[PDB]
Amino acid sequence: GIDLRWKHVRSSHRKAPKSDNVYLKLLVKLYRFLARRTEAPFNKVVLRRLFMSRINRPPVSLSRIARNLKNGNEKKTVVVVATVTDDNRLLQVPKMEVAALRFTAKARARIEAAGGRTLTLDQLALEKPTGANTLLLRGPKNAREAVKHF
Amino acid sequence: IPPKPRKILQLLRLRQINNGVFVKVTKATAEMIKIVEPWVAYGYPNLKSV
Amino acid sequence: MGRLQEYQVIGRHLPTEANPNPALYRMRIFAPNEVVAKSRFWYFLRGLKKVKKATGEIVSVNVISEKHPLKVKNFGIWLRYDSRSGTHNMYKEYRETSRVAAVEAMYADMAARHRARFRSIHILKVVELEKTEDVKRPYIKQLVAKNLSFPLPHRVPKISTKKIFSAKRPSTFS
Amino acid sequence: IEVSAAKEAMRPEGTSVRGDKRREIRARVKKNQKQMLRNQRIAAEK
Amino acid sequence: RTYRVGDIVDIKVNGAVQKGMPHKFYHGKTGVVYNVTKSAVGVIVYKRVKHRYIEKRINVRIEHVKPSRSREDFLRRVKENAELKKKAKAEGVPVQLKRQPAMPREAHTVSIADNKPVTLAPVAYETTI
RNA sequence: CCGGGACCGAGGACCGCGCUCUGCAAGGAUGCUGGCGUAAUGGUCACCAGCGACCCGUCUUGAAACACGGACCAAGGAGUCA
RNA sequence: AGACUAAUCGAACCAUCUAGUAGCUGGUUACCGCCGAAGUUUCCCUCAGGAUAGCAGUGUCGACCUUCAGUUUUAUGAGGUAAAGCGAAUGAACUUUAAAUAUGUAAGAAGCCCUUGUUACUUAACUGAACGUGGGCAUUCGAAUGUAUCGACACUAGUGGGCCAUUUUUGGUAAGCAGAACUGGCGAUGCGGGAUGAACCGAACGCGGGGUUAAGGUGCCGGAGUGGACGCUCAUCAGACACCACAAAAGGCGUUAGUACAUCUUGACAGCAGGACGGUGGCC
RNA sequence: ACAGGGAUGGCUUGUGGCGGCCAAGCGUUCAUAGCGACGUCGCUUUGAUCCUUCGAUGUCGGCUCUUCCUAUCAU
């Protein structure tokens, strides 16, 4: 027998999504290929966020995107691996280029009316396969009733 | 085995019976080997043994 | 206590600024090997001169071989042994061909007759008896007699232990 | 003297644990003296 | 000596008063001062029970308290590390800035010309007679 | 350096490290030969032999012991719904 | 007589409420795989008491970033306690020096100082310190060894004043023994050896083959030696796993090995042949 | 009445305790203390008196019948 005071630890992160969405499976395959065949850390981060659950992917609103577009970030492509929602308190939507898992109908309409573009993550993989000139955004994770009552 | 000899053997990487390691002689290691003398046999190896 | 050898072990205290040239101490140790010889040297030196192993060093270890291993000699050994009563002197004699062989016979004899282990025996002096008149014990005095001669009555012949059965009854006369 | 952290937290500033026994002795003496004075006043009234 | 909060102190119960005192565990212990009184001081000590440390707080009289010299050697080594590093930069040679464990002794020769070895028996003959 | 014996042959084009370089003992066995071609090998069942081996479940406490249930077989039989 | 009132009486029988309640007793149904425990820690009035720390499993997430550590070394505490000397002074309480055993604290850029001022602290005091400010220090980032050992949340579960033993310590008894602290084992655990077995020794476990061992053994049962050397011992139920008790400074004309003292050719120790006398039948 | 849980030991034997003294020996010999077998000494009616019986919580027996121990009453 061997004295192993320490213990080998199985991985404590997701290696695959629990979701049965077939299009999500196709995105997972594409970004597995990208994260294996490229050196860019962006693809690995996007693949990890594709694995995640919904409470780990809070929505990002247009006002949050507009806040993060300031200070030299106006021309960058916004990437959100979550749903992009509309904020009706934001009266003027700036021109922007956003890639997201999904958009609400008002968010997509307001971006197109302001003159920007909405992309899917596979269109993002086509145009920026290394994630160049991208602004990666996350929503507020702790902004949840469960987290407040923790 | 008491916790201090157990920790010294773990730091010497002698985790299984009939495990052997090479050790550079300083006071800092000589005292550890003196503590774990009830469980180990040690000595000065020659070029053939190496 | 084994195939013993006699070692000259010389040691000293480590040199210091106060004492640049420490005194050297020499001992004759009967031991199975050099590691045991040095351990016994530090044990006796701790018991005598209060010089510890950590503050001392071994200057030399040498083997003392018998000058004439082919000459039969009489040996006197003065020893002290520790028992449940305490420490006792003995003077004993051994007819052997070397000091180490006399010391081995001494250890065997002390174990057989007094149940004393290696640790409780202190060999204080081993001497060669220079003259036949120096022999004090009758069991050596009967051996150093003039014209010594004796037969060997009742000698069991050496028979191989793998030969279970014999067709003739053995004789005990040769 | 071992002192519990809760006792040090509730303890006012400047006061030490070495005077707690004198404090409780003074409180008990004060109560006994009040009872003695009450009995003295009642006996004097009688 | 006026101790202050945050100082590190040594506890040594001096005198013959350590005869039947109840709590001798903290004699020879070192801790950090958190409370100061004219004749008492508050010391934080940590006790190791199995794999975890537990905080204990004690009140020790001043005469059993001495300031500790735990960080003295560390601050000193930081100091002459700074001056010998500056001196090495000024003069242009490398210098050792890490203390090392003691090495085995090297080979040397001892003469016996005026230091002839003295033979010892297991007991001294002067004690025998 | 030279013998004597035992157990094992994982992998399945080439790639590599090498060497004593027409090749090799160098990133894991091949070559030659004989008998049989069937109950011969192998398997299952019954029994003998050597060695091994307390009767299960429950309760108790720290644990055993005590104690309780169990003649046998079939079917039924206990964390469910709002 | 608490007797009898349809075999039913300290309160009849029948149906219903009713599947009454039990904390107590019994029982509680396929397989394989991955992890895997625990017994005053701290507080509360106790027993018919509670929470709670600690120890675990699943998920995740964060740069799984910082590194840390039941260990040694270095400096400094506790233990100055042994020891050496006193041709050093002085006299465990003497000290130049200095034990073994484990033991506390500290060992960096997340740090070290310097300077600047304020102070509502403190100080005789702009004095220390705290608070901030700025600057200097990366020429080596300032011991060893190890490092599939990170952190934070969520949710879930058992156990949370049990047994045995070494050591240390505090008490005791006629003898037993009783409390604590740490550590190890067991409860949860198979295997080799102790003939046998909760607490002993060895060693920890997927299914197989070959080799070598540990503890223990090698006269036969029984695998391996009637193996080798030197001795000791003969028991009218030896001894072979003893240490505790019986049990004592115990009793032995058992047997060996020693130590001390004593005698000895000026004749020892044992015997044999002889002497063993006179005052004197001393005094009462 | 119901639901449950239960039912000191290789001990012992023939010779008192307390207090003092002695003591071979063990120790000690920069302290002359402390332990101590063998003993001993103190307390616990001229063969008397019969006019002082001092507390069941603890349970033993008998019958029949066999065997063993020896710590022996008889032979």
Side-chain angles (χ1 to χ4, degrees), chain B residues 29-42:
Chain B
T29 53
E31 301 301 320
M32 296 174 75
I33 301 173
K34 282 182 177 67
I35 298 174
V36 288
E37 277 188 355
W39 294 267
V40 308
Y42 62 106

Side-chain angles (χ1 to χ4, degrees), chain A residues 116-130:
Chain A
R117 205 156 58 101
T118 58
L119 292 97
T120 55
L121 293 186
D122 77 309
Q123 285 171 325
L124 172 75
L126 273 184
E127 293 180 354
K128 320 267 200 169
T130 60

Side-chain angles (χ1 to χ4, degrees), chain E residues 10-18 20-100:
Chain E
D10 293 333
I11 302 151
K12 176 186 171 158
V13 181
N14 47 11
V17 74
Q18 184 178 2
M21 65 179 288
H23 292 171
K24 317 190 174 185
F25 168 73
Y26 314 87
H27 167 69
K29 255 60 177 187
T30 300
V32 188
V33 167
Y34 72 98
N35 173 355
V36 188
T37 301
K38 162 194 171 184
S39 179
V41 65
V43 185
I44 291 168
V45 170
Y46 295 85
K47 185 188 287 291
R48 177 153 185 82
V49 181
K50 303 190 176 183
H51 66 276
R52 200 178 70 256
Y53 289 96
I54 297 89
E55 183 178 1
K56 300 292 191 177
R57 291 167 178 264
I58 53 177
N59 182 260
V60 193
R61 294 177 61 85
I62 303 301
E63 69 275 16
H64 315 287
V65 172
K66 296 175 182 181
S68 75
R69 307 167 57 184
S70 297
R71 297 178 63 85
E72 183 178 1
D73 165 80
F74 167 59
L75 298 184
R76 188 184 59 82
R77 286 194 332 270
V78 164
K79 188 178 188 179
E80 291 83 4
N81 276 351
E83 291 84 4
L84 281 71
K85 195 172 186 179
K86 178 189 312 300
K87 175 182 179 179
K89 200 171 185 182
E91 201 272 331
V93 296
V95 70
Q96 183 62 255
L97 295 181
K98 275 185 168 187
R99 65 199 187 277
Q100 276 291 306

Side-chain angles (χ1 to χ4, degrees), chain C residues 34 37 136:
Chain C
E34 268 205 6
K136 307 303 178 186

